[PDB]
Design a protein around this nucleic acid. Sequence first.
RNA 1: AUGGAGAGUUUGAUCCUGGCUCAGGAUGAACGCUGGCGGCGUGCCUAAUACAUGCAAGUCGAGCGAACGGACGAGAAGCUUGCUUCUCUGAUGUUAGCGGCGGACGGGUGAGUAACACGUGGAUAACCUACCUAUAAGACUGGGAUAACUUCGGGAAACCGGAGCUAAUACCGGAUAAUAUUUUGAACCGCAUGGUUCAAAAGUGAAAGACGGUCUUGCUGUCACUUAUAGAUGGAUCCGCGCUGCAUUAGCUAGUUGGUAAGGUAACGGCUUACCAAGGCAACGAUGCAUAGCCGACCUGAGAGGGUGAUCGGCCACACUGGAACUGAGACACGGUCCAGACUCCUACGGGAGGCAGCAGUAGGGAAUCUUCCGCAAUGGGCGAAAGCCUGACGGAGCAACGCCGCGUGAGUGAUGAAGGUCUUCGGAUCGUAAAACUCUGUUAUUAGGGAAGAACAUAUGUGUAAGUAACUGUGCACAUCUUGACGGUACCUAAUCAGAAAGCCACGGCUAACUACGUGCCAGCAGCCGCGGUAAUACGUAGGUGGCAAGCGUUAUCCGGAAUUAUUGGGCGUAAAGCGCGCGUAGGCGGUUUUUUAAGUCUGAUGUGAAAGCCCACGGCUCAACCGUGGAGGGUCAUUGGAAACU
RNA 2: UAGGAGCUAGCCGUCGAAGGUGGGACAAAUGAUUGGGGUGAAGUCGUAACAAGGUAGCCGUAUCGGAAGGUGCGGCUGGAU
Lengths: 198, 67, 80, 81, 89
Amino acid sequence: RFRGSNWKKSRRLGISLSGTGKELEKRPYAPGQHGPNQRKKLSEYGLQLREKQKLRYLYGMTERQFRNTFDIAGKKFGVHGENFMILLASRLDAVVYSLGLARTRRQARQLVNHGHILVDGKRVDIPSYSVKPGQTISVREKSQKLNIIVESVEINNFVPEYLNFDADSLTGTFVRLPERSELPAEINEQLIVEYYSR
Amino acid sequence: LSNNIEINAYIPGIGHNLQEHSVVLVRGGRVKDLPGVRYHIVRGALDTSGVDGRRQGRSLYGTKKPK
Amino acid sequence: NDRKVYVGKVVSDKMDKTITVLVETYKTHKLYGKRVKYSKKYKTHDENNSAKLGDIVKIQETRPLSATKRFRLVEIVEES
Amino acid sequence: ANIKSAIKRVKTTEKAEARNISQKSAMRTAVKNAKTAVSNNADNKNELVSLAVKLVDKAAQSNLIHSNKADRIKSQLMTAN
Amino acid sequence: AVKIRLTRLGSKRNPFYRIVVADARSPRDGRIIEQIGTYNPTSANAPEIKVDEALALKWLNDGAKPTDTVHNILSKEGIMKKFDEQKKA
RNA sequence: AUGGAGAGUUUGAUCCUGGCUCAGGAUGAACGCUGGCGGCGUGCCUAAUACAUGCAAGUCGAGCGAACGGACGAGAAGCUUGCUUCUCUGAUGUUAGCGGCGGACGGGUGAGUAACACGUGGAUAACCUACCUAUAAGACUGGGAUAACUUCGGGAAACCGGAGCUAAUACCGGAUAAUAUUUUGAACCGCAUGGUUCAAAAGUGAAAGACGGUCUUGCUGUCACUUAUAGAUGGAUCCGCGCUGCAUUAGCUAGUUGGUAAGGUAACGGCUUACCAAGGCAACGAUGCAUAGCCGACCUGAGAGGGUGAUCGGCCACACUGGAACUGAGACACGGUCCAGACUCCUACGGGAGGCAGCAGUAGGGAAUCUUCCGCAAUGGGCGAAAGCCUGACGGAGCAACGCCGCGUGAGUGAUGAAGGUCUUCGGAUCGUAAAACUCUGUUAUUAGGGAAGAACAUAUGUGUAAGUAACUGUGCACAUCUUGACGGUACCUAAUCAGAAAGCCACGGCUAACUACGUGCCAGCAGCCGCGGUAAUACGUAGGUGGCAAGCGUUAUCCGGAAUUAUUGGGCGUAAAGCGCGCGUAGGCGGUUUUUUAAGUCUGAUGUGAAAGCCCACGGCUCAACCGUGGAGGGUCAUUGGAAACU
RNA sequence: UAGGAGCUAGCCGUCGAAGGUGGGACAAAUGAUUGGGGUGAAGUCGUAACAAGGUAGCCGUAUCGGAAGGUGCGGCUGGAU
């Protein structure tokens, strides 16, 4: 996947949601060597590529994972720009970041692959498994606490829309699927659909 | 070639091991602004090794990736 | 049961009991949809030299009584 | 590396065809003479078939000949009878 | 003769048999006479026996034979147990 | 009607027209460089080139001769009191025959074949069918041989040449009934002809074993056996249509063309033979040439669709070549026979042999495409009740990123300058909240212990029931007792483990997001079109940033979209390419106007209704998924069917 | 006896694959030498055509000249006076 450190990633792309923010220290125009110059844009074909780059780098997958969901967005006959996102919002990638199981997603997306998260029962090793809404997104009882697991539950409450949670060993429910209004405007989801049109 | 057709094939790269009678491999790929010759010579494949002193075009011209 | 009982109209009765009726219909180019007339003579055995010139002969297929004789006679209408 | 069946079959079909050229040749003996002696209204003009229709069904009672060939035999035999 | 067999499906090291009553002169995955039902005995518990026993009344009465493994799931599931009275005609 | 934009390119500068070029997909791809692990497919595309070796179809003492070994009572003792040294009771096994089945299956290949071959729709009043299942006729008689054993010979050889012998459920003669059969009359369609009783010379089976218990056998269970029906199987024959191109292939055939009589085939006839007329076949391109197994299927197209076949299925053809037959129900037979040919091999030189397109392997050629692998555990088939053998089918392992899906190459900090150069009209932000210096997690990985499904289905393990049986095994049918597993202790689970050991590549000119210095002097060289380098190159070559995206990146070649440059949909013919020099005219195509018949063409309605991975919609199985099933949809295209006449 | 009939054998003529040549036909490869074409350099000479390009074109045709061109006869403007 991505496997980086997001401290320069808030300044590199459009946005990538590192933490509270990382651009205010140095000059936030560009990271370096050519930025404060004749500032050139790119095309709308490249803007939808850049709007793809504000969501491919945000969700952290590769292509044909951000791209093979797009043809099943052609199976769901709603708005193609946002019904793509609601199936993209219906997986285990929303768990390892948003509900706080680390100070990031990387230490917690490690924690599912050990078999130390164990959603829906015994074990789901993979985060590409779509969280089919209704299954009890649980936590392994042999990994209850760390320096990261229960810590950011106290920091970040409001496990998002149509995914509830608990402190009962930090288990959720994921009661339904959230809509496009439960999809942030940090990257405009409508402007990915035409780079994949081209 | 194998089928005994005589060509004029462009030898890309700078240095070579192509004095005579080298049992070589030949691609397509025309070099423009050069009449008749419209074939390349695969560097570093059959009986030549590729050229040495390249550091921006390293995958081509027979150079293995450094370290 | 029966056998196939197609129709026709003679072209040339060969010597000693071989009439040759003419069938023609309209096939199309499926790329174009435009149909066009086309012909396919199916040669019938005349049992007793029944059919004549002009006759719109309805015949009936059989198993081969000879090399060409695949069809036998049922219906003859007119003559010129 | 021919297996023992191929060396066994060639000899049992040597002797089975020797049993097949026993009776079929004896039938093709019978269709050479009892065919030639039933005709022209001989001494046994209607009794020669009691060996002919005997033996052409002796070929039919075993695997020597097709039964329709035995039917083909009586077609030209009993037309003369 | 014509006989019931085990024609399989499924990915690597995992069979999905749909049964077929057809001739022995065909290969095991060849062209068939009748694909009656399926049989997936390889599960954790079940043999998953789906059977439309209406046509065993035809074929076993005029030429088809059960053969040594397709015979005794019929004696297990009870397909030929219904045929036991249907052969008792 | 979920698709249909493109980028450039003729100038000193425009519009048209035109091809050409790239952007985008895919490949059995292969190559340069790279390379974590699983879960998955595919795997000489060339030489249908040639082959060493292994090695791949068998089957049954419950057929019966043999003969061998031989348990088996096995004397007297060979007195070494232990063997059989003898005899017969001699089983089982071996043989190796005779015997019935199989050999046409599984497996492999696309040369031939442009065709009924295949596909698809029909048809046989021209159809066959061992075995299997059901239906009835029933199993009478005699029987020589005959290998085996003895005997003679050859040759190191190989394997034979001769003399006498031996059993059968093998085999052959005698009569037995049948819709047999050609002679006499009553059914309808398809002229011929059929249809099912008719009624007659007819016609001949025949196999007997191990055995439940009985009867020193009887229904013969077993498993056959031969007589008259069927069910089935696969195959045959006959007409529709889909089926490459060349007239710089036009005149094609002469047993040909129709018929006339014999064949003979499961049937048909020019199929051949004696007869009759030249006829028949043709520019709608017969004829011939060249090329190619066909279809499903793949694939991209808005649809109009048409290109691939490694795939993966169905059919056809082939088995060193070319002929001829045998046997068998089924062959003109891939590990049968004979002939002829060409190649190869052994030899003691006398004559002997062999046909990898069955599975690996070898050489060859090629750019290249799997281990002289394992096990039959599952399935499936073969003969046998079964057990057993054969599986080089199959189920697995190997090897390959060649390709598909996840997995990786791992984090909260803290200097925007700790040590650091693609620049400086250096002062600097800086690679760079990069990082030393730490919190922490252990996908994989290290490595030491449980372990698994599949692996369930039999025959083995009696009571029975059903056809029941003289009674009972037997056979179909309930148990509940017990069988074995290539993969594999592999996968999986536990713990321990270090933040462990892991991405590469092309430009940074404009297309197109990713730039700057050293050489460099139209040189080296890049080069998709326009083009860079002549001493100030952002373009070359040298090096930091980034960028596109990840175990790939790039090149090469190959089909499609982009592209309506084949334009039915959806192209032009005055000057751009498109009218002969004009005609006249043969064929052909296409024709003014107005009424009525059919329902042919049109368009509809009742169904059957169109193919398996491919294809509509929704689930199930896969950790996701890769990858396999479900439910209708179902054809809405073709057939069986009713119709309607303006317009043809 | 094995004589007839048949059979093994014996001859006797019809058709045969392959062969053997035989003539050709067709196809491919090669051939001392050659003659048209393309690309480059255009090394060279001339300046034909484009300006009524110094003495308008163009077609069919015909002849000469190595070629460019020269002329001639019908037709066309896609030409100046």
